């Protein structure tokens, strides 16, 4: 029993398999992967170094590695309708780094969705390599609708004359019109890159329009809505861009890939090609809307853009607690995890933020429904109304456990 050898490691791996139990996970990014996926990542493909690409390895003994990677690649092309997939990127951050390195030059101009409006760090935060290597200019949503204004974005693109437009977000509730993004890119001579990391399982379930026919390159995490292992993926229909991408990922940015995690990508993409995955995304879409109803109705709150068509939404809580930092602090005490989150034209300071962010793929994968979500969101509006009242927060927490117990995990 290897567990005997290292007791205090495998008993932190237990405080966690239980912290995941008695937690209500509403962090929009999170999910719960199959046993098939977790098992694949724990194979002895972690012993084999496979630098290069299938039938183009640096070394031999890579025949069987080539079969497994080729599956991931083909299942990705199939699921997303792309002519080329690269499955080696270690993360979404590496996937995106490889695209910048393939299409543009150090110092070129890049338009990205602002980190207020829900851009990733790697869509131009000055802390990130993205922000330091290239000249990132953000676009926002409209101040009153909180929707993408494609006319606004065009005018800005015409003045800024970016080489690359990144679309995709971590905090945007509504359907992105990728045909309009490609039309804006085309109007100014820019490449379009769509980071679909948040919506990729919705793109796979048929519930969100695919960026793949409109983006020059589409990047994604294989985790989040797509509910695969942590890692990255690049898709393109353009064979020249494919060649630059492949060269950018290896040996441009990376060495040997994590063939065990690639095995786990092949698995997650078979599960996403399953009819059952449409049900899942349908259930993801409702559970998020159900949950979102509750904040709209309540007078002191406000679901952002008045609602959601994907797996998530924001909320302005600055009428009920000092800031979203506080709102978040409060809700942990009750066994509810989600995140402080800027909101369009953020009032407060970055560390504080005017409100929270919710999503539904985690609770949805734990097999929960519309009742549960409404329930959870009442518990939230409750807890934030009564942030100063620990008898209350204690009563809510007893109840959170009622439900966590009720619904399992594996």
Ligand X SMILES: *Cc1c(COP(=O)(O)O)cnc(C)c1O
Ligand Y SMILES: Cc1ncc(COP(=O)(O)O)c(/C=N/[C-](CO)C(=O)O)c1O
- Annotated binding residues: 115, 119-121, 239, 349-351
Sign of the torsion angle spanned by Cα atoms 73, 79, 80, 83: positive
Residues 19-78 binding ligand X (CB under 6 A) are: 29
List 93, 210, 225, 335, residue binding Na ion (CB under 5 A): 225
Shortest distance, position 90 Cβ to ligand Y, whole Å: 8
CA distance 22 to 254: 38
Does position 93 interact with ligand Y (CB under 6 A)? The reply is: yes
Part in contact with its own copies (CB under 8 A); list of ranges 125-133, 142-150, 281-289, 374-382:
125-133
What angle separates helix 370-385 from helix 276-297, to the nearest 10 degrees? 30
Does position 32 interact with its own copies (CB under 8 A)? The reply is: yes
Q: Give the count of beta carbons closer than 10 Å to the beta carbon of residue 391.
A: 7
Alpha helices in 20-145 (DSSP H): 35-40, 63-80, 92-103, 129-133
Cβ distance to ligand X smaller for residue 298 or 311: 311
Does position 195 interact with its own copies (CB under 8 A)? The reply is: no
Residues 200-229 binding its own copies (CB under 8 A) are: 223, 229
Token pair of 86 as six digits: 């690269």
Does position 221 interact with ligand X (CB under 6 A)? The reply is: yes
Shortest distance, position 14 Cβ to ligand X, whole Å: 25
Q: Residues 12-41: x/- map of binding to Na ion (CB under 5 A)?
A: ------------------------------
Does position 251 interact with ligand X (CB under 6 A)? The reply is: no
Residue 158: is it exposed, middle or buried by C-beta count within 10 angstroms (0-12/13-18/19+)? exposed
List 42, 251, 255, 350, residue binding ligand Y (CB under 6 A): 255
Residues 153-212 binding ligand Y (CB under 6 A) are: 168, 170, 195, 197-198
Q: Rounded to whole angstroms, what are the CA distances from 138 to 29, 156, 200?
A: 22, 10, 22
CA distance 172 to 145: 12
Q: Cβ distance 171 to 113 under 8 Å? A: no
| Residue 369 contact among Na ion, ligand X, ligand Y, none, beta carbon within 5 to 8 Å by kind | none
Identify the DSSP state of 46.
G
Cβ distance to Na ion smaller for residue 277 or 295: 277
List 33, 111, 197, 356, residue binding ligand X (CB under 6 A): 197
| Residue 177 contact among ligand Y, Na ion, ligand X, none, beta carbon within 5 to 8 Å by kind | none
Angle 125-126-129 from CA coordinates, rounded to 5°: 85
Does position 265 interact with ligand Y (CB under 6 A)? The reply is: no
Using CB atoms, what's the residue nearest to ligand X?
A: 255
Q: Which residues are CB-neighbours of 3 under 8 A, at least 6 positions away?
A: 10
Sign of the torsion angle spanned by Cα atoms 284, 208, 227, 77: positive
Cβ distance to ligand X smaller for residue 162 or 168: 168
Q: Cβ distance 326 to 351 under 8 Å? A: no
Angle 72-76-80 from CA coordinates, rounded to 5°: 175
Residues 256-295 binding its own copies (CB under 8 A) are: 256, 258, 260-261, 263, 266-267, 270-271, 274
List 75, 120, 227, 298, residue binding ligand Y (CB under 6 A): 120
Query: Phi, psi (5° rounding) for residue 339?
Result: -135, 135
DSSP calls for 306-331: GS-SSSEEEB--TTTSS-HHHHHHHH
Cβ distance to ligand Y smaller for residue 42 or 255: 255
Residues 90-149 binding ligand X (CB under 6 A) are: 91-93, 120, 122
State the binding site for (6S)-5,6,7,8-tetrahydrofolate.
Answer: 115, 119-121, 239, 349-351
DSSP, collapsed to helix, strand or coil, labels residue 139 as strand
| Residue 109 contact among its own copies, Na ion, ligand X, none, beta carbon within 5 to 8 Å by kind | none
Part in contact with its own copies (CB under 8 A); list of ranges 1-9, 199-207, 295-303, 380-388:
1-9
Q: Cβ distance 272 to 201 under 8 Å? A: yes
Shortest distance, position 224 Cβ to ligand X, whole Å: 6
Whether residue 251 is preceded by a cis peptide bond, meaning omega within 30 degrees of 0, is yes
Interface residue list for ligand X (CB under 6 A): 29, 91-93, 120, 122, 168, 170, 195, 197-198, 221, 230, 254-256
Interface residue list for ligand Y (CB under 6 A): 29, 49, 51, 91-93, 120, 122, 168, 170, 195, 197-198, 221, 230, 255-256
């Amino acid at each position: 029993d290897y567990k005997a050898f290292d007791p205090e490691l495998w008993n932190a791996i237990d405080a966690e398999a239980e912290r995941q139990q008695n937690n209500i996970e509403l962090i929009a990014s999170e999910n719960v992967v199959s046993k098939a996926v977790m098992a694949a990542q724990g194979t002895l493909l972690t012993n084999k170094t496979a630098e290069g690409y299938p039938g183009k390895r640096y070394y031999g003994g890579t025949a069987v590695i080539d079969v497994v990677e080729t599956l991931a690649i083909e299942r990705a092309k199939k699921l997303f309708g792309a002519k080329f997939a690269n499955v080696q990127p270690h993360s979404g951050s590496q996937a995106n780094a490889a695209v910048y390195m393939s299409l543009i030059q150090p110092g070129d101009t890049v338009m990205g969705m602002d980190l207020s409006a829900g851009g990733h760090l790697t869509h131009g935060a000055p802390v990130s390599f993205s922000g330091k290597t290239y000249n990132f200019v953000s676009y926002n949503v409209d101040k009153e609708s909180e929707l993408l204004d494609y006319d606004a974005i065009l005018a800005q693109a015409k003045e800024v004359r970016p080489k690359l437009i990144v679309a995709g977000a971590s905090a945007y509730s509504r359907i992105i019109d990728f045909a309009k993004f490609r039309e804006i890119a085309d109007a100014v001579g820019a490449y379009l890159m769509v980071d679909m990391a948040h919506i990729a399982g919705l793109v796979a379930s048929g519930h969100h329009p695919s960026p793949v026919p409109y983006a020059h390159v589409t990047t994604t995490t294989t985790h989040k809505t797509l509910r695969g292992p942590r890692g990255g993926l690049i898709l393109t229909d353009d064979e020249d861009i494919a060649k630059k991408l492949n060269s950018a990922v290896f040996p441009g940015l990376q060495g040997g890939p994590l063939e065990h995690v690639i095995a786990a990508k092949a698995v997650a993409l078979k599960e996403a090609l399953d009819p059952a995955f449409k049900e899942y995304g349908e259930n993801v879409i409702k559970n998020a809307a159900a949950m979102a109803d509750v904040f709209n109705q309540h007078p002191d709150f406000r679901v952002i853009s008045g609602g959601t068509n994907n797996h998530l939404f924001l909320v302005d809580v600055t009428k009920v607690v000092e800031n979203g930092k506080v709102a978040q602090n409060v809700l942990e005490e009750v066994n509810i995890t989600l995140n402080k989150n800027s909101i369009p034209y953020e009032q407060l300071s970055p560390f504080k933020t005017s409100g929270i962010r919710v999503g539904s793929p985690a609770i949805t994968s734990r097999g929960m429904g519309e009742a549960e979500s409404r329930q959870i969101a009442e518990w939230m509006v409750e807890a934030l109304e009564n942030h100063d009242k620990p008898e209350v927060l204690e009563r809510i927490r007893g109840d959170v456990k009622v439900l966590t117990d009720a619904f399992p995990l594996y």
